[PDB]
Design a protein around this nucleic acid. Structure first.
Ligand SMILES: [Mg+2]
Ligand SMILES: [Mg+2]
Ligand SMILES: [Mg+2]
Ligand SMILES: [Mg+2]
Ligand SMILES: [Mg+2]
Ligand SMILES: [Mg+2]
Ligand SMILES: [Mg+2]
Ligand SMILES: [Mg+2]
Ligand SMILES: [Mg+2]
Ligand SMILES: [Mg+2]
Ligand SMILES: [Mg+2]
Ligand SMILES: [Mg+2]
Ligand SMILES: [Mg+2]
Ligand SMILES: [Mg+2]
Ligand SMILES: [Mg+2]
Ligand SMILES: [Mg+2]
Ligand SMILES: [Mg+2]
Ligand SMILES: [Mg+2]
Ligand SMILES: [Mg+2]
Ligand SMILES: [Mg+2]
Ligand SMILES: [Mg+2]
Ligand SMILES: [Mg+2]
Ligand SMILES: [Mg+2]
Ligand SMILES: [Mg+2]
Ligand SMILES: [Mg+2]
Ligand SMILES: [Mg+2]
Ligand SMILES: [Mg+2]
Ligand SMILES: [Mg+2]
Ligand SMILES: [Mg+2]
Ligand SMILES: [Mg+2]
Ligand SMILES: [Mg+2]
Ligand SMILES: [Mg+2]
Ligand SMILES: [Mg+2]
Ligand SMILES: [Mg+2]
Ligand SMILES: [Mg+2]
Ligand SMILES: [Mg+2]
Ligand SMILES: [Mg+2]
Ligand SMILES: [Mg+2]
Ligand SMILES: [Mg+2]
Ligand SMILES: [Mg+2]
Ligand SMILES: [Mg+2]
Ligand SMILES: [Mg+2]
Ligand SMILES: [Mg+2]
Ligand SMILES: [Mg+2]
Ligand SMILES: [Mg+2]
Ligand SMILES: [Mg+2]
Ligand SMILES: [Mg+2]
Ligand SMILES: [Mg+2]
Ligand SMILES: [Mg+2]
Ligand SMILES: [Mg+2]
Ligand SMILES: [Mg+2]
Ligand SMILES: [Mg+2]
Ligand SMILES: [Mg+2]
Ligand SMILES: [Mg+2]
Ligand SMILES: [Mg+2]
Ligand SMILES: [Mg+2]
Ligand SMILES: [Mg+2]
Ligand SMILES: [Zn+2]
Lengths: 71, 65
RNA sequence: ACCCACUCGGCACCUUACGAGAAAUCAAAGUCUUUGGGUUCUGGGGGGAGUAUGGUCGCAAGGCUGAAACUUAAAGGAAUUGACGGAAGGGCACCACCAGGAGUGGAGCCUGCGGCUUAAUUUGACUCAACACGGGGAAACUCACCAGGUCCAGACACAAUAAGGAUUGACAGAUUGAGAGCUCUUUCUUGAUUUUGUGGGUGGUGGUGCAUGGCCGUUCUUAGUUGGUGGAGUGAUUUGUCUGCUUAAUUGCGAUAACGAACGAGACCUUAACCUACUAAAUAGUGGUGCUAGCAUUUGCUGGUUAUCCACUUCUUAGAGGGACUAUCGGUUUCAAGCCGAUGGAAGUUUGAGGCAAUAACAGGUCUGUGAUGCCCUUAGACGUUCUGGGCCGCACGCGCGCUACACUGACGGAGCCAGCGAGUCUAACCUUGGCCGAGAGGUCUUGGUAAUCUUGUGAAACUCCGUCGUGCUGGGGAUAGAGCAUUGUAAUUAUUGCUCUUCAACGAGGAAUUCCUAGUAAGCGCAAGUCAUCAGCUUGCGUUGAUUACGUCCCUGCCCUUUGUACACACC
């Protein structure tokens, strides 16, 4: 046929990063628990799901993307 | 010809083997005498009914009833 | 000298074959396993090789005598059937020719093929039997090619990672052709569905039609293939299956060691022709009647009226029948099969035209129709797939099929005005009448039809008639090109198609060559169907107008057949 070429640079993938995560939540001196990061007022996401903290940006990942709550 | 439609069944079948494939081709010609619902013979066939020896003569005479 | 009869001994031929032989053949090649008349010579698988060596003869060239090593499974004879020939004799045919028709080959464009060009211009096929072929009319798709971007739709098994998350997704920005979370930033989400690895799969218009199936084309516009009982032969085989005649035909007659048959041809089937006979019909039509228009008026003539009723089946439809069997008569022939002419006939060229179609062959074409398929390749930086964009259309030029022309048997313009084969919309937008608007293309409002019901009598084109032009590249011809308007489509640029104005090329009948054709045929002419969103200069069918010329032959070509040769049989590649 022909075989091969490449001006180079192959494309990669993704990782789902790492993170021992949900440390986010904080409980005081025995044993009251206060949530850090605020949750979602979409009926689909019964307020377990949180909003990621960027800039302007607070965002529901559970809603696969859906919705832009901003405080 | 037409008798083909009437009297022969055919089938082709592809038989897939380890090496390649073979073609089986079967042809059956059925007794037309037995036809049942169609023509009982080939268009070819021409039977003559076989007469009968006659013992003629017997000078006139007539029967009455 | 000549004729007849006989007889010795010659050179030969003929027919037989009791007899011989592996056969071809042989009055010897007979009198041979029922093996002996006399005698002489030579051979003992093929090659090595009539070679080496010694002897001998010769002027020589050479003659006579004449080994082995080694190699090898056949070499060889006769006949049989095939195949094949640049041998001979016959035949068949408008993919041959004769007599001619209409052309192509010259021109413009259309369209395939080569070639060149190209990022790519995807590819198969190259005499008939490749090149308007792959139903191949490609804007996306198709699509295979090129520039680039996603995705897994990587079954299953085992192992590994791993609930402290195996894995999944994404808003905005960056990026990107892109409102692709492709990747990146950032940090939520998801929960054992995946991920990683090996094994194994899977897809592929990737390769192989020289691995196959199937299908198809070609031989073949051909006429050939086989078996029973008999005859010949040790046998493979042959005769039957043939000199002739005849047919489109191994179709028949006839001849005959053959007789009588079967596949194939024929029969059969389909379609086109004929039925005042049959059965019928508001989804076909005719006559009467009513309702009614117009013109004459003296009855009349020409229409309207899917039902106002009555009757019919000539025309239309399709079931069932009938019909033709080359009939009658006559010429001709071996007085056979047949052929010819005349009359009759809807029909007498296999009635016309097709469908089916034996045995065998080809390294014909097709793996790019198939979830038909072997093997090879490839398989996540994909040859899987999808998305964006380009390409198959690229243009010094060679070849093929075509369309339109060169005008006056014509172009233009009024007017006349007649087909047949088709096809059309359900969970959809197909065939479209009618009304308006518009120069046109088209638009718009309604409408009938899943259809013998509506489009549609598809009022098709050539054609007919009355005019204009008047032989002038002319008002023949309409290539090329400019501007504008609409239609299909998400998309029209490289211009899908349609319309209007304008531009007005070559082409003044086409060298060598070469295609096709015998009656409703050729040629002219349009239409419907296929393809189809849009696009026919293509095909497949259809009807309309409708001739000239053969009704013969073997000169060219092609092919079949005998006879003949063969050292071929994988068969003259
Ligand atoms: Mg968190
Ligand atoms: Mg037949
Ligand atoms: Mg003999
Ligand atoms: Mg003898
Ligand atoms: Mg004698
Ligand atoms: Mg020897
Ligand atoms: Mg030697
Ligand atoms: Mg010597
Ligand atoms: Mg010597
Ligand atoms: Mg001398
Ligand atoms: Mg010697
Ligand atoms: Mg010697
Ligand atoms: Mg021979
Ligand atoms: Mg001629
Ligand atoms: Mg000519
Ligand atoms: Mg290709
Ligand atoms: Mg041919
Ligand atoms: Mg594409
Ligand atoms: Mg995707
Ligand atoms: Mg794997
Ligand atoms: Mg593997
Ligand atoms: Mg495939
Ligand atoms: Mg082949
Ligand atoms: Mg094949
Ligand atoms: Mg090939
Ligand atoms: Mg002919
Ligand atoms: Mg013969
Ligand atoms: Mg035979
Ligand atoms: Mg024939
Ligand atoms: Mg009157
Ligand atoms: Mg009157
Ligand atoms: Mg009738
Ligand atoms: Mg007559
Ligand atoms: Mg017929
Ligand atoms: Mg080949
Ligand atoms: Mg195939
Ligand atoms: Mg394959
Ligand atoms: Mg296909
Ligand atoms: Mg199949
Ligand atoms: Mg591939
Ligand atoms: Mg092309
Ligand atoms: Mg060519
Ligand atoms: Mg052609
Ligand atoms: Mg006219
Ligand atoms: Mg206007
Ligand atoms: Mg309707
Ligand atoms: Mg009609
Ligand atoms: Mg001129
Ligand atoms: Mg003109
Ligand atoms: Mg364009
Ligand atoms: Mg182009
Ligand atoms: Mg002019
Ligand atoms: Mg001419
Ligand atoms: Mg097109
Ligand atoms: Mg069409
Ligand atoms: Mg075509
Ligand atoms: Mg010889
Ligand atoms: Zn949410």
């Amino acid at each position: 046929x022909x075989x091969x070429x490449x001006x180079x640079x192959x494309x990669x993938x993704x990782x789902x990063x790492x993170x021992x995560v949900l440390s986010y939540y904080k409980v005081d001196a025995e044993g009251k628990v206060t949530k850090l990061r605020r949750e979602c007022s979409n009926p689909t996401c019964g307020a377990g799901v949180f909003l990621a903290n960027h800039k302007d940006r607070l965002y529901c990942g559970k809603c696969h993307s859906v919705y832009k709550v901003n405080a | 010809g037409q008798p083909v439609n009437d009297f022969i069944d055919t089938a082709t079948r592809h038989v897939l083997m380890r090496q390649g494939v073979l073609g089986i081709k079967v042809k059956i010609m059925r007794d037309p005498a037995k036809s049942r619902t169609g023509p009982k013979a080939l268009p070819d066939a021409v039977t003559i009914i076989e007469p009968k020896e006659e013992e003629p003569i017997l000078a006139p005479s007539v029967k009455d009833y």
